[PDB]
Amino acid sequence: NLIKQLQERGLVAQVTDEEALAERLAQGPIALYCGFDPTADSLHLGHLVPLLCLKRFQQAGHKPVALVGGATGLIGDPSFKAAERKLNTEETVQEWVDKIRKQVAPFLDFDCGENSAIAANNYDWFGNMNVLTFLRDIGKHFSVNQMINKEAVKQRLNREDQGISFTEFSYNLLQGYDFACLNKQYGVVLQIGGSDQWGNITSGIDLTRRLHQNQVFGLTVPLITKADGTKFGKAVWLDPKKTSPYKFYQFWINTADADVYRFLKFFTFMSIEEINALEEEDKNSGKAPRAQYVLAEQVTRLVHGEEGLQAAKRITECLFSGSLSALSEADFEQLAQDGVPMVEMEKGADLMQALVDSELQPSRGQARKTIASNAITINGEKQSDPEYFFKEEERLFGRFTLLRRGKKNYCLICWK
Amino acid sequence: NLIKQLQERGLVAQVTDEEALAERLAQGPIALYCGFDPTADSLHLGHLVPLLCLKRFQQAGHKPVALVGGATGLIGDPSFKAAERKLNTEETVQEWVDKIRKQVAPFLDFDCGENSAIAANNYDWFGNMNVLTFLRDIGKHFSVNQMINKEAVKQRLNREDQGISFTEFSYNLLQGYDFACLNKQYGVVLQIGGSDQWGNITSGIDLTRRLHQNQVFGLTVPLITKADGTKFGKGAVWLDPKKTSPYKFYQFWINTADADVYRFLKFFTFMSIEEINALEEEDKAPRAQYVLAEQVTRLVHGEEGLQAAKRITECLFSGSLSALSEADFEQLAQDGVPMVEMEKGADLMQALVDSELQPSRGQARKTIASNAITINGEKQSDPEYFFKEEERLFGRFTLLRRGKKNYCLICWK
Ligand SMILES: N[C@@H](Cc1ccc(O)cc1)C(=O)NS(=O)(=O)OC[C@H]1O[C@@H](n2ccc(=O)[nH]c2=O)[C@H](O)[C@@H]1O
Numbered sequence A: 001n002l003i004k005q006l007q008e009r010g011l012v013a014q015v016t017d018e019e020a021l022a023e024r025l026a027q028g029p030i031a032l033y034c035g036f037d038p039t040a041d042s043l044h045l046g047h048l049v050p051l052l053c054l055k056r057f058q059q060a061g062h063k064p065v066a067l068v069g070g071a072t073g074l075i076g077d078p079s080f081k082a083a084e085r086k087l088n089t090e091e092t093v094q095e096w097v098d099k100i101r102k103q104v105a106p107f108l109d110f111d112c113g114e115n116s117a118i119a120a121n122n123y124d125w126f127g128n129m130n131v132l133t134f135l136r137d138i139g140k141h142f143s144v145n146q147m148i149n150k151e152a153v154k155q156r157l158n159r160e161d162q163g164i165s166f167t168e169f170s171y172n173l174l175q176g177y178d179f180a181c182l183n184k185q186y187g188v189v190l191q192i193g194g195s196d197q198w199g200n201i202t203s204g205i206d207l208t209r210r211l212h213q214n215q216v217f218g219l220t221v222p223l224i225t226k227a228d229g230t231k232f233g234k235a236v237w238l239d240p241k242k243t244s245p246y247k248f249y250q251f252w253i254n255t256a257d258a259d260v261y262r263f264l265k266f267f268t269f270m271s272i273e274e275i276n277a278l279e280e281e282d283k284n285s286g287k288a289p290r291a292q293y294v295l296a297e298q299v300t301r302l303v304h305g306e307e308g309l310q311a312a313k314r315i316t317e318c319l320f321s322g323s324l325s326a327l328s329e330a331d332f333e334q335l336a337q338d339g340v341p342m343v344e345m346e347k348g349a350d351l352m353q354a355l356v357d358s359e360l361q362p363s364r365g366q367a368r369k370t371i372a373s374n375a376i377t378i379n380g381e382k383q384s385d386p387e388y389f390f391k392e393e394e395r396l397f398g399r400f401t402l403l404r405r406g407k408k409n410y411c412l413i414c415w416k
Numbered sequence B: 001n002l003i004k005q006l007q008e009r010g011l012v013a014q015v016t017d018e019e020a021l022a023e024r025l026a027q028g029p030i031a032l033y034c035g036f037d038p039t040a041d042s043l044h045l046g047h048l049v050p051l052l053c054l055k056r057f058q059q060a061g062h063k064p065v066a067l068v069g070g071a072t073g074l075i076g077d078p079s080f081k082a083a084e085r086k087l088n089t090e091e092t093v094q095e096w097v098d099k100i101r102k103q104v105a106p107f108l109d110f111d112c113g114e115n116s117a118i119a120a121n122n123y124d125w126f127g128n129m130n131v132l133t134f135l136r137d138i139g140k141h142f143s144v145n146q147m148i149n150k151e152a153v154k155q156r157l158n159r160e161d162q163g164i165s166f167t168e169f170s171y172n173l174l175q176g177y178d179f180a181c182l183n184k185q186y187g188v189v190l191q192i193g194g195s196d197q198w199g200n201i202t203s204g205i206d207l208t209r210r211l212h213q214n215q216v217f218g219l220t221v222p223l224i225t226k227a228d229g230t231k232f233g234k235g236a237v238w239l240d241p242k243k244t245s246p247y248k249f250y251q252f253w254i255n256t257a258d259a260d261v262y263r264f265l266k267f268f269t270f271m272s273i274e275e276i277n278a279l280e281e282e283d284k285a286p287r288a289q290y291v292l293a294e295q296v297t298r299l300v301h302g303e304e305g306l307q308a309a310k311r312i313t314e315c316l317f318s319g320s321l322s323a324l325s326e327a328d329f330e331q332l333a334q335d336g337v338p339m340v341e342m343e344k345g346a347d348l349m350q351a352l353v354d355s356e357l358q359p360s361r362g363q364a365r366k367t368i369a370s371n372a373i374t375i376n377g378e379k380q381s382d383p384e385y386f387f388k389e390e391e392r393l394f395g396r397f398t399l400l401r402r403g404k405k406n407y408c409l410i411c412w413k
């Protein structure tokens, strides 16, 4: 029972007519979909849970359709958003559509027979749809009375100053019609998404009934919350030019103990039995948990590949050990991007001024004392001379020196 | 000052930035518009007040644009309407558009130089507009918080069972864009309509500022109410003679209450305000109801219509029917007097029973013998009488009257 398997992983928030859907899944393969709007040049970790759920359905023999919102991205989803978004240009949205489509594709199998994945774009049917056709054929089936009362937009109708445009208010209809289109085009009978999408999904179920006289289903995945109550992202992009593999890997390494097993269930393809054995091992080891290391390895390999995972571990190992000889120029570029705090400095700066400019020390007088106390390392090597100037060999690849005050305060000097 | 002149006739419900509009009108001709949606094959008396208002602006030298809602008629205006309307087909709406455009055209001058009237249809811009273009270029300028607070749709936003579809809720944006579109195409700076249109007009004023950075204005005419509190023109009083005959039209006006007659001359005629006031004091039989009937009937149905209406009225009052033509009897059968269809050979007693002028043959016999019945205005007191062929006027019609005023028209099969 796929729904029950997803429920044990904590991956089912809500499901329409669960018995009928489970009966349909057990009968044979179904086609299902999940949509992703282009609001940026990359997806982030928030988008990964439903994307990986498409794969989980596919591994059970179902056919996933990954829709990218070429049209909906020109409108903007208001669902549980406190503020009206500015409209994006057609040129920017198209550039983002191509990037997202390409980023999504490796997570799904496009070559596994009948249930091979399908890439879809709702601009195909909205780009040539007349406004009177939309208002009459689609709009007549929507009650404004019900629409203004949906949880996703109700808060936006409290104050005019923090209100909602007719553009964003119409979004629900567009996503509604997409479900009817995919049902007609590919026999799609299930739509999945995060729990904020419930109302957009159910409008599609109701419209598919009205337009195509077909019974279709909805299933949502919970939005991730941490046990402490704080917000999940602290955003973590899938694109390495936005969030380096090192920072990505470190984010998972630093997962709280109360979230690590749930995150393994949400973000990995490890069996429930293995995750339960990992939790049990951590419970009776007599040591701190090792699950964070397993979670970091799994998700980093999934998103950034074996090469990305090895680069994340090599940077982590070098930063910890102090020995930087194993680092490449590309590794230092991850560090400069977002790995450790960084500063740009003109070559010839003494150690004292590097400490002040890097904000590792408030003044040169303070810098002098901390150097003399043997609290500073240069590329992991201790340097106790206050009057010290860096040697040309300490500027790695001619432009990198890593300063560390104590055991954990880093600043990468990027020489100009 | 034209606004002052309209206020004196009681034709101004509301007006935006009034000093500026009066100033714009005073410096020279403006282009203005009023829209009419196709919800039937004819306009009715309710539509006459803003229609004549376009002509009142045109006489003052302004350029009227008469818009027929070929696109808006496919959506449906919910303004102050208690219930959602069913969608009409594209084929039906197109038939109504052509009938309404042709009914409006004689009320305005399409050949008077610079200020010649223009017929417009919003299907010309909405019929091929892409949905994303509409939602982005127009929809972004509309606040749902503001829309749900418009007086015209409030009664519809309390309960789902007396609710509003997304279709009718989007209407306000189409009428809003129409004003912006007419401002760009023809330099239209004023929109008029009845008071129910206030919110649709003010949305157009706001959108024109947002889209074209132009200042435009709105003016509404009051919805006609009676002194007694009842509904005006109550079914409806249509402009189409095949729906409401010129006789029935004329009679409706003759029977206007004295408390409404002077206000109605101001709203429905081109008579000067000086003339109407002079007519008001003089009544302290009033000739006003007769003057109102004469003016509006001539305006809608022409001199030929007015003469037929007067000719039928006169023949029914006198009982002398020789002046009635075949077409006059056709007006009587349509809606002029109660009518009953009958097979030729029916006796007088049967005609009185079938027409419901008498409850039984035995009673009809007593009524006929009492000299209460006229056949085409001639007394007939033989209870056993059968109609003569010459009494079937144009081989089709016989008018019975019981007593001094109860008529029934027999239409022979
Ligand atoms: N309206 C959806 C995209 C969509 C869906 C179906 C269509 O037919 C058309 C468009 C939307 O705006 N999605 S999203 O791009 O913001 O996110 C994609 C998915 O990721 C989930 N998500 C997003 C952010 C987050 O932190 N957590 C989360 O689960 C959302 O619920 C959605 O299912």
Ligand SMILES: N[C@@H](Cc1ccc(O)cc1)C(=O)NS(=O)(=O)OC[C@H]1O[C@@H](n2ccc(=O)[nH]c2=O)[C@H](O)[C@@H]1O
Pocket (backbone or CB within 6 Å): B034, B035, B036, B037, B038, B045, B046, B047, B049, B050, B067, B069, B072, B077, B122, B174, B175, B176, B178, B179, B192, B193, B194, B195, B196, B197, B200, B221, B222, B223, B224
């Ligand atoms: N929404 C308007 C038509 C319209 C106007 C402007 C546009 O850009 C597009 C469409 C509408 O539905 N009008 S109506 O066809 O119902 O009536 C036409 C006019 O007659 C007035 N009217 C209607 C009935 C009545 O009893 N009294 C009255 O004054 C209305 O206020 C409107 O100005």
Ligand SMILES: [Cl-]
Pocket (backbone or CB within 6 Å): B344, B345, B346, B386, B387, B388, B389
């Ligand atoms: Cl006879």
